[PDB]
Structure formats: C-alpha cells, structure tokens
Enzyme design. Structure first.
Site, PDB file in Angstrom:
ATOM      1  N   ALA A  83       3.933   1.688  -0.952  1.00 16.15           N
ATOM      2  CA  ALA A  83       4.572   1.828  -2.261  1.00 16.15           C
ATOM      3  C   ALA A  83       3.640   2.469  -3.293  1.00 16.15           C
ATOM      4  CB  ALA A  83       5.057   0.464  -2.747  1.00 16.15           C
ATOM      5  N   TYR A 126       0.825  -1.201   0.000  1.00 16.78           N
ATOM      6  CA  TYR A 126       0.000   0.000   0.000  1.00 16.78           C
ATOM      7  C   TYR A 126       0.864   1.258   0.000  1.00 16.78           C
ATOM      8  CZ  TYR A 126      -3.681   3.320   1.347  1.00 16.78           C
ATOM      9  OH  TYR A 126      -4.574   4.370   1.371  1.00 16.78           O
TER      10      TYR A 126
HETATM   11  N1  LIG Z   1      -9.383   6.407   5.452  1.00 17.33           N
HETATM   12  C1  LIG Z   1      -9.466   6.146   4.168  1.00 17.33           C
HETATM   13  O1  LIG Z   1     -10.474   5.628   3.648  1.00 17.33           O
HETATM   14  C2  LIG Z   1      -8.290   6.512   3.306  1.00 17.33           C
HETATM   15  C3  LIG Z   1      -7.177   7.141   3.852  1.00 17.33           C
HETATM   16  C4  LIG Z   1      -6.115   7.499   3.040  1.00 17.33           C
HETATM   17  C5  LIG Z   1      -6.175   7.233   1.694  1.00 17.33           C
HETATM   18  N2  LIG Z   1      -7.265   6.626   1.181  1.00 17.33           N
HETATM   19  C6  LIG Z   1      -7.416   6.340  -0.299  1.00 17.33           C
HETATM   20  O2  LIG Z   1      -8.488   7.101  -0.796  1.00 17.33           O
HETATM   21  C7  LIG Z   1      -9.132   6.360  -1.865  1.00 17.33           C
HETATM   22  C8  LIG Z   1     -10.615   6.213  -1.598  1.00 17.33           C
HETATM   23  O3  LIG Z   1     -10.833   5.467  -0.387  1.00 17.33           O
HETATM   24  P1  LIG Z   1     -12.315   5.086   0.091  1.00 17.33           P
HETATM   25  O4  LIG Z   1     -12.569   5.669   1.427  1.00 17.33           O
HETATM   26  O5  LIG Z   1     -13.255   5.387  -1.015  1.00 17.33           O
HETATM   27  O6  LIG Z   1     -12.104   3.513   0.232  1.00 17.33           O
HETATM   28  P2  LIG Z   1     -13.116   2.298   0.394  1.00 17.33           P
HETATM   29  O7  LIG Z   1     -12.419   1.149   1.003  1.00 17.33           O
HETATM   30  O8  LIG Z   1     -14.252   2.873   1.223  1.00 17.33           O
HETATM   31  O9  LIG Z   1     -13.614   2.022  -1.101  1.00 17.33           O
HETATM   32  C9  LIG Z   1     -14.077   0.711  -1.456  1.00 17.33           C
HETATM   33  C10 LIG Z   1     -14.840   0.831  -2.747  1.00 17.33           C
HETATM   34  O10 LIG Z   1     -13.939   0.626  -3.863  1.00 17.33           O
HETATM   35  C11 LIG Z   1     -14.411  -0.458  -4.638  1.00 17.33           C
HETATM   36  N3  LIG Z   1     -13.291  -1.175  -5.240  1.00 17.33           N
HETATM   37  C12 LIG Z   1     -12.461  -2.084  -4.637  1.00 17.33           C
HETATM   38  N4  LIG Z   1     -11.690  -2.739  -5.470  1.00 17.33           N
HETATM   39  C13 LIG Z   1     -12.030  -2.218  -6.709  1.00 17.33           C
HETATM   40  C14 LIG Z   1     -11.609  -2.527  -8.018  1.00 17.33           C
HETATM   41  N5  LIG Z   1     -10.710  -3.474  -8.304  1.00 17.33           N
HETATM   42  N6  LIG Z   1     -12.148  -1.821  -9.035  1.00 17.33           N
HETATM   43  C15 LIG Z   1     -13.047  -0.873  -8.754  1.00 17.33           C
HETATM   44  N7  LIG Z   1     -13.537  -0.507  -7.566  1.00 17.33           N
HETATM   45  C16 LIG Z   1     -12.992  -1.233  -6.581  1.00 17.33           C
HETATM   46  C17 LIG Z   1     -15.258  -1.304  -3.691  1.00 17.33           C
HETATM   47  O11 LIG Z   1     -16.154  -2.143  -4.406  1.00 17.33           O
HETATM   48  C18 LIG Z   1     -15.954  -0.200  -2.901  1.00 17.33           C
HETATM   49  O12 LIG Z   1     -17.058   0.379  -3.584  1.00 17.33           O
HETATM   50  C19 LIG Z   1      -8.356   5.050  -1.993  1.00 17.33           C
HETATM   51  O13 LIG Z   1      -7.344   5.196  -2.982  1.00 17.33           O
HETATM   52  C20 LIG Z   1      -7.751   4.888  -0.602  1.00 17.33           C
HETATM   53  O14 LIG Z   1      -6.568   4.101  -0.602  1.00 17.33           O
HETATM   54  C21 LIG Z   1      -8.305   6.255   1.948  1.00 17.33           C
END
Ligand SMILES: NC(=O)c1ccc[n+]([C@@H]2O[C@H](COP(=O)([O-])OP(=O)(O)OC[C@H]3O[C@@H](n4cnc5c(N)ncnc54)[C@H](O)[C@@H]3O)[C@@H](O)[C@H]2O)c1
Ligand SMILES: NC(=O)c1ccc[n+]([C@@H]2O[C@H](COP(=O)([O-])OP(=O)(O)OC[C@H]3O[C@@H](n4cnc5c(N)ncnc54)[C@H](O)[C@@H]3O)[C@@H](O)[C@H]2O)c1
Ligand SMILES: NC(=O)c1ccc[n+]([C@@H]2O[C@H](COP(=O)([O-])OP(=O)(O)OC[C@H]3O[C@@H](n4cnc5c(N)ncnc54)[C@H](O)[C@@H]3O)[C@@H](O)[C@H]2O)c1
Ligand SMILES: NC(=O)c1ccc[n+]([C@@H]2O[C@H](COP(=O)([O-])OP(=O)(O)OC[C@H]3O[C@@H](n4cnc5c(N)ncnc54)[C@H](O)[C@@H]3O)[C@@H](O)[C@H]2O)c1
Lengths: 245, 235, 237, 245
Positions: free
Chosen positions: D155, D153
C-alpha cells in the site's frame, strides 16, 4: 551527466530526423562510434560532416522497410567497428489519418516502417551484439494515451513497448532492451500540427514547455550507460508530465 | 451473470478456436445473432450446427489476414442481420519461435493475422456498426509480462492494447472499444503455484468478460483492456 | 447484465453517498442482503427504507476511520446474515487542498478514512468472508492521472491499487480482490470535461455499481488483483 | 558512471540503509553537499566519516515518522547549505506480516514511516527547494507485482507512485518529482527473504542476478540530473527484468 562511450559503437536508423540528430550528436560527443542510416542519404551525409570525426563515423542510405538494408547496416557495423554496443531503431513515420479515411496502403506503410523495420534491424543485429550491449526502442505518448487520429501509429508504438519486454527476456543477460516514450517534441514531424496548438500543449504540460530532441537523446544515452545496468524491459516516459503512465 | 443480447449481432473471427467457441456459445445462449468466421469452414460448420439455432447463426470461410474476406464478413452481417452490435477480432496464431531462429516469414505471418487482420475487420466494419456497439480486442498476458519465445506475438498483443485506446477515442461515442488480456487458459505445477486462484482459466471465463464489456454494465468503460489471468500477473 | 445475488451479503461503507447508494440499489435489486454503514445514520435509514425489503437490509452508524466500528460492522453482518460475500469499502473523502496549504490534520484525515479504514474493514472481515467472495476497492482517476490539488487523496487511491494486488495474492483462492477506478461521475469545468471525454458525458453512479457487480459475479471468476478504469475514456491506463 | 553535482544539496533520509548509503556515496563523489538523516546516528556518522569531505556533509538524527524532525532536517539544509536541490525520502521499513496476522500496530508503524514521513519531508521542504530541484521517491516491485505477505508495505509503495504524479503536477515547473521502483536488491532488507528464496529469484530474473544498491543510486542520480530535464511524474523500474510494468 557525462557518458563514457569510447570504443563503443552505436547503430542509429532515421539519423537525419529531429530526435535522430540529437541522438547522434550526444553519442559522438561521448566518444562512441556511429553507424548512421537514413532514407535521406544527402541530409545524413551533410549532417554527419558537422559532427565530423570520420574515424568514428560510417553512414549508409537505408529504407527501414528493407530487410536487406538491415543486413547491410549490420555488416557495415561489423566491418568498420567489429560489433554493436547500442542499437537504436529511431526511423518512423507519423501520419495523421482519421480511421474512417485510412486506406490499406496507409496502414501497411506505417506498420512496415515503424514495426517490421524494427524487427529486421533487431534480428540481423544479434550476432554483432557485444557484451553489455543495449537496444533502445522509440515508443510514443500515443501508445499510452491513445492516438487521436493515428490508430496505425499508436498500434506500432504499443508494439514497441511489448516487443521491448519480449526481447529483454530473450537477449538477457548479455543485452539489455529498453525504450523511450517521448511526449510532444518540437521537430519537423510535429511542426504542422503543432503550430496552432503550442499554447494549448504547454498549458496541458506541467513543465509548461515543449520537449527538445536533446531531452529524448539524453534518456537514450542514460539507458545505454552503466547507470542503467539493472534496467531492462523498461520504457521511460519523457513528456514533461503531460501524461502519467 | 445473465446477458440479454436478443436481436443484437456478434461478428467473431477465429470462431472455431478454444476461446472463440466459448464466445460464440455464450453470445448464442444470450439470444444474439452470430456471424462466425474461421479458416476451418468444416470444423466451424460442425460447431455451429451443435448450437442449433441456424436462423441466428451465419458462417463463412474467412482468412483473417485477407481484406477481401473482411469485406465479405461485414457484407454477410449486413445481409443476414442488417448490422453489427459486437465486433470481436479473435482470430490469432501463437507460434513458439526463439528470436534468434525467427524467419522473416515467421514475423510477417504473425503480424499479418494478429494485427493487419484486426485493422481490416475494424475498418470494413465501420459502416455496419450500430448504436451502442462494442469492439472487443484480444490482447494477452504476453503483452504485459513479455513473451518468453514469441517476440512477434508479444508485439501484436501490445499493438492491440494501444490500438484499442486509439479506436476508443475515434469511434466514441457511438461505439466503445475495449480489450481482454487472457492469462493461462486450458510444468502445470509451476503455473498453479504462480497463480493465486491455483488453476488454469477456462475459455468460458474469457467469454464472460467479453460479454460484460459488450453489455450495458460496461456503458462507461472504453479504451480499457482487462486482465483475466487468475492473478498470475498484475498489470 | 442481471445479477443473481440471492442469499449473498454485501457489506458497503459510505452507503449513503452517490456511488454508495447506486451500489446498494443494484445489489438489493439483485436479491442480495445488505449491511449498510455510513456516518450519517438518519440519511442512510431514510435511503434504506426506500429500497423496501427490510428483512434484507441492516444499517449501522459507523465511522470508516474507526477500527471499533469495523468490528461492529462485521459482527452485524455475522448476526443478521451469517457472513460476507461482497465487501466494498466505499467510504472516502475528497478534499481540494493545494499541497502548499495542506495541514498535517488535512493529510491525516484523508489517510485515516481512505486508507486506514480500508485496512480495518478488510482485516476484521476475514473470518466472516464466505467462499467465492469478493472485495472490491474504490480507486480513482487521480491515482493514475495524478491529482491536481489532492496529493493526499491521490496517495490513498494509489495505495488502493497496490493493496488490491497484495490482498488478491493473500486471500486467494477463497476470495477475489479487485478494484474500480471511477472517472468524472455526476454525484463549472463541464466544457473542459466533455472535450476530454470520448463518450462526451459525465459518468453515472449506476455505471460504477454495475462494474462492481460484474467483479462480484461469476462473470469475473478468473479476474483477481485487477483495477478496472470506468471513466468514459477520459484517461487510458 | 559519474555526475557533476558540485554546489548542489542532497537531503537523504534513511541514509545509513543499504540503498541509502549507495545514494550518499554517489552524490558525494559527484561533488554534492549532503544532509544525511537516520534513526541510527552512530551508524550514519561512522559512515559519513568514510566518504570524508566533511565540510560537504551534515548529519542529524531524525525519525522519518516525526514532523518535527522533518522541519529540523530542512532547517539544517538551510543553515549549512542554503537550500535543497535533491530531496530523496528513502527511509522505510519492510515487515513480513501475513494479512491474517497483521496487527493495527503493524499497519500504523509501516504507514507512518513509509508514507506519512514522505508527506512530512516533502511538505516541510517546499520553502527550501531551489530552481531545477528534484524529489525522487522510492517505490518497490511490491507496488506493481503485489506484495506476497506485506499488504501494508505494498500500500505505501503504491501511494508513492501516485503521490509522485500528484506532486509533479503541483511543484512543476520549478521542481521535477519522479520515483525509482527497485527489484530485489542485495541489502540487509532482503537477507532474511533470500536465505530460502535465492534460487527462485535468480531463476525469475532475466539478468540472472540480484541488484546492487549502487544500481538504484545511479538511476536516482540520472533523475536528478539535466539528462532527465523533461521527465516528471515518472517512476522507473530498476529490477533486472524480474517484472515488467
Ligand atoms: N531491497 C531493498 O532494500 C529495497 C527494495 C525495494 C524498495 N526498497 C525501498 O528503498 C528504500 C531504501 O531501502 P534501504 O535498502 O535503504 O533499506 P534498509 O532496510 O537497508 O534501511 C534501514 C535504515 O533506515 C533507518 N530507518 C528505519 N526506520 C527509520 C525511521 N523511522 N526514521 C528514520 N530512519 C529509519 C534504519 O535505522 C537504517 O539506517 C526504502 O523505502 C525501501 O522500502 C528497498
Ligand atoms: N514529437 C515527436 O517528434 C515524437 C513523439 C513521439 C515519438 N516519436 C518517435 O520518435 C522517432 C524519431 O522521431 P523524429 O523526430 O526523428 O522524426 P522525423 O520525422 O523528424 O524524422 C524521422 C527520420 O526518418 C527518416 N525516414 C522516413 N522514412 C524512412 C524509412 N523508410 N527508412 C529510413 N528512414 C526513414 C526521415 O527521413 C527522417 O530523417 C520516430 O519513431 C517517432 O515516431 C517522435
Ligand atoms: N490460452 C489462449 O488460448 C490464449 C491466451 C492469451 C491470448 N489468447 C488470444 O485469444 C484469441 C483467441 O484464442 P483461441 O483460444 O480462440 O485460440 P485458438 O488457437 O484455439 O484458435 C485457433 C482458431 O483460429 C483459426 N485461425 C487460425 N488462423 C486463422 C486465420 N488466418 N484466419 C482465420 N481464422 C484463423 C483456426 O482455424 C482455429 O479455429 C487469439 O487472438 C489468441 O492469441 C489466447
Ligand atoms: N466522482 C466520485 O464520486 C468519485 C470519483 C472517483 C472515485 N471515487 C471514490 O468512490 C468512493 C465512493 O464515492 P461516493 O460517490 O460514494 O462519494 P460521496 O462523497 O458521494 O459519499 C460520501 C459518503 O460517505 C460518508 N462518509 C464520509 N466520511 C465517512 C466516514 N468517516 N465514515 C463513514 N462514512 C463516511 C458520508 O456520510 C457520505 O454519505 C469513494 O472512496 C470516492 O473517493 C468517487
């Protein structure tokens, strides 16, 4: 983006400069109260007239290096509008001075205005800061890229970045403290140096243009706004890509 | 590792401090000439005596915040050893002072020693710097992490990082200008848990990075400030 | 400095490259054992012969993108020298490819060598790492300045910086994990490069190797998670 | 905070996730057209209905790891709205996996979704990007602080920061490319982590709270808006001060 600053009060030093004027115009258009200070009392008062809504505007002649003027500025903010929502210490000097020629007076003048003055204003402002308030410091590309002929200027702008982090810890959760790091902005500050180097600068800049003062002001407004409610301690680069930090 | 600093001259302010003594010790063991300054002449002279190569050591009482003492420090290096190979403005104060309680005097004293003083020494040293010389500044974890109750200290250490970049540009190619940012150097349990290497840093572990930056091993490194903090903070 | 790496073992991929050869030479001159890998087996063996302490040198043909070759590399280190003190995943490719022209194959090839390969080597090396060991990754100026025509390359070198921080946390205190970010190394636009470089010259591969050696040495015993810029001041990060 | 995005088109992957939903809500409320993708189409369509100006919303089941789905996503944006104004590759996975236990399958799964997928979407989007468009990537605190048990992650999120800089150079001046680096956000991604580590997180956070998904969306909107017109290459920390970068 439209900012909702009605009944929120900005204190802005160096208000007659290039970036300072852009800041004042945007915040005033957004409904905020303005406490403008500057060393040049005549330009500031004339400029303020064009922005004119005196019910929301108060001005004072103030030297950034004067601790007592920081006290006067806060007292005026308290007296006229009852507090401070946004604090922006924009006043600064940019002297081209190769290090081998830099006098002790050269050094002290830049540190006093660009650094001591920021301390004075932040310290005196503390009792007047309201809930959900913001401090936004002015850093510079030079703090990150390294100044070419301004080691004193670069020092004070690196001090801004770290001071922002320190105060962000101490004034949380009531007050957020952030900064803006401008790149090459067309103002009288850069006019002489830049007149023979505009093409060279644009060639180095991915967006292929010089920055405008309003493009610094809009980022300051963002940092003060609810859109930045989870941003603190952070200095944002605003340089068209000329430098990645 | 092993440094070969024979016939090369270190000027070190605040030389009687914890990190300061470690630096003097390493460079002296490496064959260097030392020009040591500190506000505590008596403490410093006792320490300098313990190293025992007095022909390679010169000491002087100097206030880091005094431009006159900076001139005297450089003249001493010129007089005893003819120039400066390594300039380390290490003298600094670290005052715990919540921002709401910080006096104007509190602020100026920290800026004067930690920042103005670095300007004075670097500027006065310019005529004395030799070929292949180094300036190494001392930043701090606080510059990067944000000080908890030392906003003046953090400001001066952020200034070191940017001032290092500025002087690296101006003094190149003759002199390289770099910095070291120490972490927690010997609520201890919390620090151990937060530190990947699970211990406090030793002053000798700051000195060895300074020596590296002064050595030919760093010959293509300039403008750079290195974190030396056991992993407690990633910058 | 002079490094005392006697009876300590360096595993170095891409060992036949410009920077790779400089690392091998320095560590070998410092008394270290070398496990050298490269895609070019004949060139590497010829290079290894020139160093002339074959008892202290072992070579292998290995594709950095191959997890099997990573396993074989570590097994060779285990068999010949009993472990790994220094792991330097130096193998990489640098392709000039404007993003509008970048094929899916272009992207995958760079991620496979520059990023997947570092994972395989670090992961497979874990049981063989000795106490007070070091991993030193190779980042790049491009990670910090932004690549001009190499978005895949730039991505992999930003990944190096963050992966270095992650492994620093996980592999401490036994192993320190750091990186070196080279600038412009002689290994035209020369007038432009000299103008932007405070030291007014190109970097030498030996000047990358000496910083890697520093990071592997006790002089860096309190440094972990850190990537050091070695670029003559061309870029300040 | 409210933005004016009428007749501009957002393409957003992972639109049903915690932060993804917040992005979609803000831009839609701001008058934008939405092309939403997610692997969980039933969830997405149910969500898409609630915001309902349905003529301004198009959804598609698309796997971020699939180059063909990226092409289908761009083709949908072209067919329904004629182009792309904002490109936000938000889809990602976050796996807790100590490095000593990390399988090759673990590694490839995360690099494929979090990094390859961003390449596929940006590359396939190039013909459809309009003037003054923006790409905004999602980095993470982990890229800067170092992930504790997620080297893959970390990376991919460091790759985002550097890839953002590279693409800002190549796609300027037509398109600005920026990023947002969230801290600890109240979201399903963090439910497992914060069951045992909630006390420490609030202790370490200057603002003394978890971030809300909406507080990431508002910074993305700023970067897409004219207020950021001189910002490119830049990744902004949105973490309540938990980490200073
Ligand atoms: N606290 C956090 O949520 C957080 C913190 C820092 C960074 N981020 C980053 O921000 C972004 C958004 O996070 P989020 O809160 O929406 O996360 P999340 O875990 O809530 O999102 C999951 C969603 O993404 C979909 N998904 C999973 N694999 C997929 C694939 N192969 N193709 C398409 N869709 C897929 C799932 O079906 C689901 O709808 C991500 O890149 C995450 O790494 C999140
Ligand atoms: N390209 C740029 O203009 C640029 C780039 C990076 C950073 N910055 C920083 O942004 C800030 C604002 O820049 P600007 O364009 O407004 O500069 P400017 O030179 O155009 O204006 C600065 C203003 O401060 C006033 N001033 C000078 N000394 C003063 C003192 N002692 N007390 C009070 N006021 C005083 C001047 O009269 C002027 O009105 C400065 O801190 C500057 O260092 C500017
Ligand atoms: N844990 C740490 O010690 C630590 C951590 C991060 C950064 N740093 C920085 O590293 C540098 C060296 O630290 P140290 O361990 O030597 O600190 P120290 O506190 O042990 O050193 C104090 C020494 O400096 C002298 N000194 C004080 N004021 C002076 C003045 N005005 N002029 C001259 N000498 C003066 C004192 O007499 C004493 O000998 C400093 O700049 C410090 O801020 C230290
Ligand atoms: N100027 C520079 O050389 C420079 C600048 C910045 C960063 N770096 C990085 O430093 C590292 C070392 O660079 P270098 O000077 O050795 O580069 P190089 O191009 O001189 O070395 C290439 C070497 O790697 C080998 N190689 C290529 N693909 C391989 C594969 N799949 N498996 C195994 N070996 C393979 C080749 O046989 C060759 O010997 C690289 O990661 C590079 O990206 C280099």
């Amino acid at each position: 983006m439209k900012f909702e600053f009605e009944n929120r009060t900005l204190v802005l030093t160096g208000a007659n400069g290039g970036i300072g004027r852009a800041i004042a115009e945007l915040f005033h258009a957004s409904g905020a109260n303005l406490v403008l200070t500057d060393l040049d009392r005549e330009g500031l008062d004339a400029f303020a007239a064009s922005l004119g809504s005196p019910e929301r505007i108060a001005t004072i002649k103030a030297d950034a290096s004067s601790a007592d003027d920081a006290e006067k500025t806060v007292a005026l903010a308290m007296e006229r509008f009852g507090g401070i929502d946004f604090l922006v210490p924009s006043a600064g000097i940019y002297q081209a001075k190769p290090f081998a020629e830099m006098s002790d007076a050269d050094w002290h003048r830049t540190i006093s205005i660009n650094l001591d003055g920021v301390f004075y204003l932040c310290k005196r402002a503390l009792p007047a800061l309201k809930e959900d308030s913001s401090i936004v410091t002015l850093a510079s590309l030079a703090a990150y890229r390294g100044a070419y002929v301004n080691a004193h200027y670069g020092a004070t702008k690196g001090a801004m970045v770290s001071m922002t982090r320190a105060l962000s810890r101490e004034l949380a959760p009531k007050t957020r403290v952030n900064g803006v790091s401008p790149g090459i902005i067309e103002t009288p500050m850069t006019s002489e140096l830049l007149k023979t180097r505009m093409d060279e600068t644009m060639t180095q800049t991915p967006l292929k243009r010089l920055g405008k003062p309003s493009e610094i002001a809009s980022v300051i407004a963002f940092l003060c706004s609810p859109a930045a409610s989870f941003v603190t301690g952070e200095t944002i680069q605003v340089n068209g890509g000329i430098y990645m930090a």
